Amino acid sequence: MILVTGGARSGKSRHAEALIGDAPQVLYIATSQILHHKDGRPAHWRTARHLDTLITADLAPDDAILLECITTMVTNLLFALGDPEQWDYAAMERAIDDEIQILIAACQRCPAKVVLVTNEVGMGIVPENRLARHFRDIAGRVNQRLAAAADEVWLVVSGIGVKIK
Amino acid sequence: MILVTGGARSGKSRHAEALIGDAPQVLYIATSQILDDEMAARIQHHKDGRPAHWRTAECWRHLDTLITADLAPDDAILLECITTMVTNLLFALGGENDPEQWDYAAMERAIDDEIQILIAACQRCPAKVVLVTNEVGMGIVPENRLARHFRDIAGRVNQRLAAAADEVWLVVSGIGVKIK
Amino acid sequence: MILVTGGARSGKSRHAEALIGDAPQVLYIATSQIARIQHHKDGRPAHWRTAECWRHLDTLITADLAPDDAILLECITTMVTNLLFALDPEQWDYAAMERAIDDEIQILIAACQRCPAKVVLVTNEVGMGIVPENRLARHFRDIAGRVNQRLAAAADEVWLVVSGIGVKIK
Ligand SMILES: Nc1nc2c(ncn2[C@@H]2O[C@H](COP(=O)(O)O)[C@@H](O)[C@H]2O)c(=O)[nH]1
Numbered sequence: 474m475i476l477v478t479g480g481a482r483s484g485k486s487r488h489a490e491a492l493i494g495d496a497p498q499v500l501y502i503a504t505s506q507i508l509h510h511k512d513g514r515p516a517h518w519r520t521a522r523h524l525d526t527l528i529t530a531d532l533a534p535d536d537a538i539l540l541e542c543i544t545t546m547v548t549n550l551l552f553a554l555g556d557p558e559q560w561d562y563a564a565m566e567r568a569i570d571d572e573i574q575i576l577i578a579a580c581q582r583c584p585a586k587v588v589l590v591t592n593e594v595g596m597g598i599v600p601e602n603r604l605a606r607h608f609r610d611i612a613g614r615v616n617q618r619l620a621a622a623a624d625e626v627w628l629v630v631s632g633i634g635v636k637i638k
Numbered sequence: 639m640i641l642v643t644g645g646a647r648s649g650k651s652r653h654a655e656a657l658i659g660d661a662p663q664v665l666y667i668a669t670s671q672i673l674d675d676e677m678a679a680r681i682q683h684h685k686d687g688r689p690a691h692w693r694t695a696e697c698w699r700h701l702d703t704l705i706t707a708d709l710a711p712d713d714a715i716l717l718e719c720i721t722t723m724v725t726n727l728l729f730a731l732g733g734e735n736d737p738e739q740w741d742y743a744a745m746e747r748a749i750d751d752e753i754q755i756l757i758a759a760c761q762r763c764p765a766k767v768v769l770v771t772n773e774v775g776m777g778i779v780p781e782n783r784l785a786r787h788f789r790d791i792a793g794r795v796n797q798r799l800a801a802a803a804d805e806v807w808l809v810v811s812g813i814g815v816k817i818k
Numbered sequence: 819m820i821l822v823t824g825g826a827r828s829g830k831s832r833h834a835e836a837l838i839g840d841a842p843q844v845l846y847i848a849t850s851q852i853a854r855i856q857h858h859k860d861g862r863p864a865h866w867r868t869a870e871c872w873r874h875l876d877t878l879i880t881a882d883l884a885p886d887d888a889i890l891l892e893c894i895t896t897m898v899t900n901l902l903f904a905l906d907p908e909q910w911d912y913a914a915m916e917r918a919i920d921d922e923i924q925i926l927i928a929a930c931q932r933c934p935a936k937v938v939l940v941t942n943e944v945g946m947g948i949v950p951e952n953r954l955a956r957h958f959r960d961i962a963g964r965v966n967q968r969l970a971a972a973a974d975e976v977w978l979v980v981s982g983i984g985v986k987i988k
Pocket residue numbers: 651667668669670671672680681684685694696718719722
């Protein structure tokens with residue numbers, strides 16, 4: 474696949490989409506749990522966890538999948554895997570890794586264009602909040618995995634896509 | 639124009655300044671409001687290094703009044719910085735109401751207006767125009783309501799500016815990176 | 819010398835270790851003040867000795883050091899932190915603190931100027947987030963950046979590492 478990263482309000486979405494282009498058929502994997510976009514989304518696009526079920530081997534090369542976003546997906550999983558003070562951050566990481574490996578696998582075998590969106594969350598200062606701190610570590614480790622797995626990697630800054638790989 | 643971004647103490651000020659260089663007449667546009675002796679004391683070093691052929695203005699509204707169309711193509715303008723301006727606008731807007739009770743949707747809409755104007759100005763200005771902004775969203779989601787919103791807002795302003803820019807540079811550890 | 823920067827868990831360390839290579843003899847300078855560490859060691863080669871210090875690096879970064887040998891410093895930000903703490907965080911004279919910090923930076927810098935061995939320093943990007951409410955953190959974050967510029971300016975090669983991907987900026 475293709476991995477797009479960047480800070481909040483970096484324009485990574487727009488860049489991802491720009492990566493999608495027309496693209497005949499487009500599957501949007503919208504990971505946030507609901508605790509304006511759905512409107513700007515072309516009517517043609519479909520909107521959809523249990524991700525490997527979507528990222529299939531029997532798709533078209535002209536087809537395209539957009540997952541938004543990896544971070545969120547990470548978050549949902551911890552909680553799912555889970556109060557965060559009794560948490561064994563270590564075990565959590567591993568499990569998370571399993572999952573990511575699964576995504577990778579799926580993406581690996583998927584004939585469609587796959588574009589994954591994630592965020593850079595650790596160019597800031599060490600947070601005081603443990604989960605927060607934990608969180609940031611795991612997310613970075615997840616990104617490395619994806620990146621390594623990725624074919625192309627972009628970093629978006631101020632809406633400017635920078636192809637790092 | 640040229641857009642220059644980086645985190646705090648990235649060296650973007652100095653890189654910006656380098657972008658301008660030897661220009662005969664320079665106008666430094668300074669958007670900070672000194673709300674402390676600390677904030678004031680530091681602006682000091684800024685001035686202290688400022689040149690004689692550089693005029694300062696202590697402004698952050700209507701730069702359209704500053705970034706002008708009769709300007710000489712050999713002259714330059716350095717605006718420092720977007721983020722402050724944005725922060726300046728945000729509390730203006732906010733008024734004597736708590737940030738809590740703020741209408742970020744509104745504010746952001748009002749914010750875009752002033753940005754649009756700025757872009758137009760920069761677009762119609764024959765002089766070299768450099769703007770300094772900050773990268774503030776490479777970290778963890780902010781607990782504090784505003785902050786969280788200000789971060790969104792900043793990012794959006796950034797995109798626009800960048801979009802508009804003829805040139806963009808990311809400066810890391812004092813190292814300028816031309817991304818556009 | 820080589821400066822490698824990036825954020826927390828950006829794969830900068832791996833990248834760093836990668837610049838080191840099959841460096842026969844390597845000195846690992848761990849600035850962290852003390853389990854998490856237990857393992858770092860654990861995954862550290864045999865022909866690599868470790869020096870736990872964040873002061874007088876000039877004591878380790880020597881002129882006699884063999885070219886084909888290397889130094890891996892990890893990490894600058896930490897060092898910084900300890901430094902500040904060396905010098906109540908509210909009643910701190912930041913301007914002064916910072917100057918001392920730079921004194922130590924200059925040492926480090928001159929040291930790497932005459933060390934014939936490969937010197938790699940690892941630091942982090944920490945000013946790409948929002949302005950902190952905490953006054954130390956604000957200053958820390960401020961000192962941290964100035965320190966990076968100096969090093970970067972001193973370094974021969976500068977790499978920004980993103981999501982495990984290395985970007986050569988200098
Ligand atoms: N009000 C005001 N702010 C200034 C002046 N010179 C620089 N600044 C502010 O100083 C900022 C940069 O901070 P500095 O470069 O310490 O660390 C810019 O955001 C700019 O608005 C000046 O003469 N007046």
